[PDB]
Amino acid sequence: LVHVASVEKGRSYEDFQKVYNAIALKLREDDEYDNAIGYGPVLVRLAWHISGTWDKHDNTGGSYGGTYRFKKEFNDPSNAGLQNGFKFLEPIHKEFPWISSGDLFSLGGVTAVQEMQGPKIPWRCGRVDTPEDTTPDNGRLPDADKDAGYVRTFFQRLNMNDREVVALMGAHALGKTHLKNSGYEGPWGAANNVFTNEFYLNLLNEDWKLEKNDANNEQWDSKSGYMMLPTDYSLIQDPKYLSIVKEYANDQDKFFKDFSKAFEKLLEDGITFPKDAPSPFIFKTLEEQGL
């Protein structure tokens, strides 16, 4: 399987910037969502989920084909709760109907990070919608009740090394778990809709208590009212993971740079970009445009 990226006929950067600005204006406006957390977090998660189905072995899955749009994928249990991000994006697509799906889902993730004060994430257009039959089967997304070994193994299928995994994970500073969706309940920290290294700090600074929740699953609870999934916790149990955690706990810039790089890679997995494809775009935030 080869997935060549193909630019939406006749579109340029300015075309993309507009889709970006629309998402952003919308994020700004719909701030009541999930108790005033806003849709940032969920869009970030969505871009990760349409992208995490990839399989470096056979090149199936990944962001390319925008298959989330199909029932099989859309209804994946691991996907519970993502429908709200989709719904957020729907009208945007209606306004900009020539954008491919995979392009839109993934751009929402970039927009979300950047508008939530994260680092700039270069992004590339060119994703093409594929047929319903290219929809990966459910079961490719990772479980949360596991450990570092599982985590390592898992991310390996997506070609991510330890450093990439710890970087990516710091996105857990955003949003929160919801019982009805995954069987976990609680936020990982305090500034849940602003992008910072908070995740590492909490994991290193709080006094976590293992407990079972109402769904009868285990989670690490903190006095401050925070939580950590077993997979989150596993990062301090592993020697290799732990020192990277420490590093991010100490240097938010390092964290941002590594995150940026890992995130793009994650969203660009499985796609082939011809030599004549345009360079990646770096979008301006609203604020940079004075809007």
Ligand code: HEM
């Ligand atoms: C070990 C791998 C992963 C595990 C098992 C996992 C598990 C989870 C779970 C259980 C949820 C909460 C769902 C809910 O009840 O609404 C969650 C939410 C979240 N995930 Fe992860 N995750 C992992 C990887 C990632 C990564 C790589 C990213 C992005 C880079 C991501 C970004 C987020 C975001 C921002 C949310 C909050 C969503 C919201 O507030 O609705 N997670 N993840």
